[PDB]
């Protein structure tokens, strides 16, 4: 059975804080078949390499994808000093990972564009003393604690959101704000890959 990467090629890719995660097990994969369809602008890895990630056997392969403007490549480089790693998307510290930035060629019209790019620029708890804010950051490999209060696309740059927390939850509020970047002529995306060499047999292998 060949791992089927077709879902990336169909529909509107979510924004970075709503990244779509696909988990592959017990299948053979052809990574170059996927990547050859895109114009790859950046391809960086941690604890693995582009050559190795395409050629090893894993207990599982996890593929994340989202809309992401190439002009925010540096917002990735700043890592937890900037809003993407703080509030939107932060890959595993525990397993090898890669992060790919790619442009959608004009031929792939089945990938439809969102109205704009959006990301979360603030996620904080406003405490019951109605005074101090405590930032609530994303944990590696997880979704933002503010995904439930930010819309799938931010309507206007700087829009602000809040949700009252119950007394049992400690009171106060969960608060967030969104930023936007204008859509590009061709859609630009990020692909995140995490692999696991697990107890479970390494039955995610390259197609030969």
């Amino acid at each position, epitope marked *: 059975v060949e791992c089927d990467f077709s879902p990336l090629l169909s529909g509107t890719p979510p924004q970075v804080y709503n990244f779509k995660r696909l988990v592959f097990t017990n299948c053979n994969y052809n990574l170059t078949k*996927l990547l050859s*369809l895109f114009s790859v602008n950046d391809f960086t890895c941690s604890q693995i390499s582009p050559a190795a990630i395409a050629s090893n056997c894993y207990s599982s392969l996890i593929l994340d994808y989202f809309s992401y403007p190439l002009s925010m490549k540096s917002d990735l480089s700043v890592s937890s000093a900037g809003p993407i790693s703080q509030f939107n998307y932060k890959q595993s510290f525990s397993n090898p990972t890669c992060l790919i930035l790619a442009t959608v060629p*004009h*031929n792939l*019209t*089945t990938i439809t564009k969102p109205l704009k790019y959006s990301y979360i620029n603030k996620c904080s708890r406003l405490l019951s003393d109605d005074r101090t804010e405590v930032p609530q950051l994303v944990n590696a490999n997880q979704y933002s604690p503010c995904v439930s209060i930010v819309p799938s696309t931010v309507w206007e740059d700087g829009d602000y959101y809040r949700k009252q927390l119950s007394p049992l939850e400690g009171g106060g509020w969960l608060v967030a704000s969104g930023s936007t970047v204008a859509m590009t002529e061709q859609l630009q995306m990020g692909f995140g890959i995490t692999v696991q060499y697990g107890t479970d047999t390494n039955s995610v292998c390259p197609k030969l």
Partner: nanobody
Amino acid sequence: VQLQESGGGSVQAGGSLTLSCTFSSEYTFTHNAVGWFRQAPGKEREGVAAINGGGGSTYYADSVKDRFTISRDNANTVASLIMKNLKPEDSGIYYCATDVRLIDWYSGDWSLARLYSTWGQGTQVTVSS
């Protein structure tokens, strides 16, 4: 059903026909693709043309290039096949198909019938010398 071919008929060699693949009112191929195939007695089913939602990618069999044209409406609910300069060996039952495995479709396998999960009932094309 879901896929319906129309527009087939009988025609003299050198004539033309336009086939239509109409999706049920609730369905679209906006995020997928449509292939046109044909079946002749004693031959395997043959892909002749295909197009994706949005029309960014179009493919043609060598046997029909420069004679056939595949197109879509803006809404990706009708895929049309304009066939010109028809030959007797173009006679067949013509099928449209959708719900394709997209990655393989984009990667050179557009004409592989097994990749398509949803098939119309077909329309008759009869070309007479």
